[PDB]
């Protein structure tokens, strides 16, 4: 099992949720976060002066899936979150050793 | 070392904190998140019409513990967070390779 | 690749960001969280009476880096976040198996 961790543009959350749902991936954890990547935020022109915003509002989407489902989950997120501009997002894959459903106590290892 | 990541009902946080404390597990990180599981949220009846809420407020509890302590931490969370209804929570176990205490610089590997 | 996860005092975020930037580590994810460590929060005296605050506001800094860069990232965070008092923070290192840039689709494994 793996956890797919995507940090996307907040306005792309609905697109991502729908692309994952259509593929049968419904379970996910969503966190409001802030971040920046390799461009260290954005430079804007305001009243003829350059202004820097080095930390932007982002949405973190965490999806725990089977090892074989990772590539598909990554493809679903890329296809629905992509705009072609800096800041589209990063996806990180982290190993998950155990998964427990609290209600039933069932544990997948 | 492992990180035990529990996503629980927000109203169960105090129960979970107390169950972990009684067992000597005090250190934890708590994040307000949103999510859904296999039932894709909830269906409610409002003014004679069916309404869907597909992302619910949840509380993420992260507890870094020794490898041998995992099962106990998982049991403590299940016993205190469980209601017997859909949405009680999921628990994921993730490997932690290093743990550093900033104040002292001590690092456990 | 590894994810360096630091839980620091909120007032140290700017120091940490600058120390990481000076070393060329710009990409990071920042989350507002709450937590406590081994001292189980703080005890304050208010109106001649002892009061306990068992969960404090903290800032989680997540930095995905190459395996060889971990130690430096940990040193940068320790040097800029340290005050010498309980609550300076914890740093956890978690393995990252894949990293994808959404815009380009490039994947580092
Ligand atoms: N090395 C990193 N460690 C942790 N989080 C990161 C890292 N890089 C980026 N992120 C997170 O991913 C979000 C999206 O990053 P972004 O899409 O700008 O990545 P990028 O590498 O700069 O690619 P691009 O050139 O397409 O912008 C960031 O705002 C931050 O929350
Ligand atoms: N596959 C998953 N990936 C990431 N987070 C998940 C996943 N499944 C559930 N979660 C998180 O766990 C929270 C609790 O999920 P929930 O208890 O409903 O799980 P479940 O598998 O549907 O079990 P149940 O049938 O008892 O409801 C969700 O709201 C979401 O934040
Ligand atoms: N075992 C743990 N599991 C998960 N998060 C933890 C753990 N211990 C501490 N944290 C997080 O790290 C933050 C900082 O912890 P803190 O610096 O107080 O650690 P400590 O072990 O008590 O060291 P110190 O004695 O210097 O205070 C906490 O508020 C919490 O968010
Ligand atoms: O995140 C954005 O929307 C633009 C900024 C960016 O790409 C970055 O900081 O790397
Ligand atoms: O989370 C809940 O409280 C009910 C919804 C649920 O179980 C789910 O979406 O899987
Ligand atoms: O976090 C603090 O600022 C003081 C409390 C502390 O160190 C703890 O709970 O372990
Ligand atoms: Mg970028
Ligand atoms: Mg459910
Ligand atoms: Mg402490």
Residue numbers in the entry:
A (entry chain A), B (entry chain A), C (entry chain A): 1 to 109
How does the study describe this entry?
It forms a tightly packed trimer with approximate dimensions of 30×54 Å. GlnK proteins, when activated, are sequestered to the cytoplasmic membrane where they bind directly to their corresponding Amt proteins, physically blocking ammonium uptake by inserting the T-loops deeply into the transporters' substrate channels.
2-OG bound to Af-GlnK3 with high affinity, but it did so exclusively in the presence of ATP and Mg2+. Its ligands are three oxo groups from all three phosphates of ATP (thereby discerning ATP form ADP), and one α-carboxy oxygen atom and the α-keto-oxygen of 2-OG. The γ-amido oxygen atom of residue Gln 39 completes the six-fold coordination. Residue Arg 47 that is crucial for insertion into the substrate channels of the Amt protein upon complex formation, remains poised at the apex of the loop. However, 2-OG is fixed at the base of the loop in a wedge-like manner and pushes the T-loops outward with respect to their conformation in the ADP-bound state. In both structures, the Cα atoms of residue Arg 47 form an equilateral triangle, but while the sides of this triangle in a complex with the Amt protein have a length of 31 Å, they are extended to 46 Å in the form with bound 2-OG. Under conditions of sufficient energy and nitrogen, both ATP and 2-oxoglutarate levels will be high and the GlnK protein will reside in this blocked state.
